[PDB]
Amino acid sequence: NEKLIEEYKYRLQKLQNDEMIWTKERQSLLEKMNNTENYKIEMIKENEMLREQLKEAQSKLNEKNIQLRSKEIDVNKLSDRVLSLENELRNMEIELDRN
Amino acid sequence: EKLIEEYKYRLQKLQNDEMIWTKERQSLLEKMNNTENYKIEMIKENEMLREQLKEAQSKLNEKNIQLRSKEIDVNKLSDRVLSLENELRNMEIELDRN
C-alpha cells in the first residue's frame, strides 16, 4: 500500500500547508481590523474634543450677548442723559436772551 | 488497513477545517464591513461637528466686532454727556454775569 499511503501523505501535506496560509491571512485580517478600530477611536477622541469646543463656543456666545445687552442699556441711559442735558441747555439759553 | 482508516479520518478532519475556515473568513469579512461602516459614520460625525464649530466661531467673531464697536459707541455718548455738562456751566457763567 506504498502508493496509497503516499497519496494520503501528499494531500495531508497540502492541507497542513494551507493551515499556515489560513493562519497567515487571519493574522492579516486581525491587523487590518485593529487599524480600522484604532482610527475609529481616534475619530471618537476628536469628536469628544469637538463637542467640548462647541460647548465652550456657545458659552462665550451667551456671555458676549449678555455683554452686548449691557452696553445697549449704557447707550439707552446715556442717550436719555444727552436729551435731558440738551433740554436743560435750551432752557438756560432761553433765560439768557430774556435778560 | 487500520493505518488507512487513520489517514482517511485525518484527511476528512483537515478537509472539514478548510470548509469551516471559508465560513470563518466570510464571518471576518462581514465584521470588517461593519467596522468600516462605524468608521464612516464617525467620519461623517467628525465633519458635521467641524462645520458646527466653524459656524459657532464665525458667529462668535462677529460679536467681538459688535461688542468693540458698541464700546466706541458708548464712549462717544459718554464724551457727549461731559461736553453738555461743560456747556451748561459755561451757560451758568454767562447767566451769572447778567
From Swiss-Prot, chain A:
Q: Which domain of life is it from?
A: Eukaryota
Q: Which residues form a coiled coil?
A: 1-99
Localization, per the record, is:
Cytoplasm, Cytoskeleton, Microtubule organizing center, Spindle pole body; Cytoplasm, Cytoskeleton, Spindle; Chromosome, Centromere, Kinetochore
The record describes the protein's role as: Binds to the plus end of microtubules and regulates microtubule dynamics and microtubule organization. May play a role in the attachment, organization, and/or dynamics of microtubule ends at the spindle pole body. Stabilizes both cytoplasmic and nuclear microtubules. Promotes mitotic spindle elongation in anaphase. Has microtubule polymerase activity by accelerating microtubule growth and inhibiting catastrophe.
Under the subunit heading, UniProt states: Binds to microtubules. Homodimer; each monomer can bind via its TOG domains to two alpha/beta-tubulin heterodimers. Interacts with SPC72. Associates with the NDC80 complex.
Recorded family membership: Belongs to the TOG/XMAP215 family.
Q: Know anything about its domains from the record?
A: The coiled coil domain mediates homodimerization. The TOG (tumor overexpressed gene) domains are composed of six (for the most part non-canonical) HEAT repeats each. Intra-HEAT loops are positioned along a face of the TOG domain and bind to a single alpha/beta-tubulin heterodimer. Two sets of TOG domains may wrap around a single free tubulin heterodimer accompanied by a open-to-closed conformational change of the STU2 homodimer. Both, TOG 1 and TOG 2 bind curved alpha/beta-tubulin with comparable affinity; the two TOG domains bind noncooperatively to two tubulin heterodimers.
Misc. remarks from the entry: Mutations in STU2 suppress a cold-sensitive mutation in TUB2. Present with 1660 molecules/cell in log phase SD medium.
Protein name as annotated:
Protein STU2
Give the organism's phylogenetic lineage: Eukaryota, Fungi, Dikarya, Ascomycota, Saccharomycotina
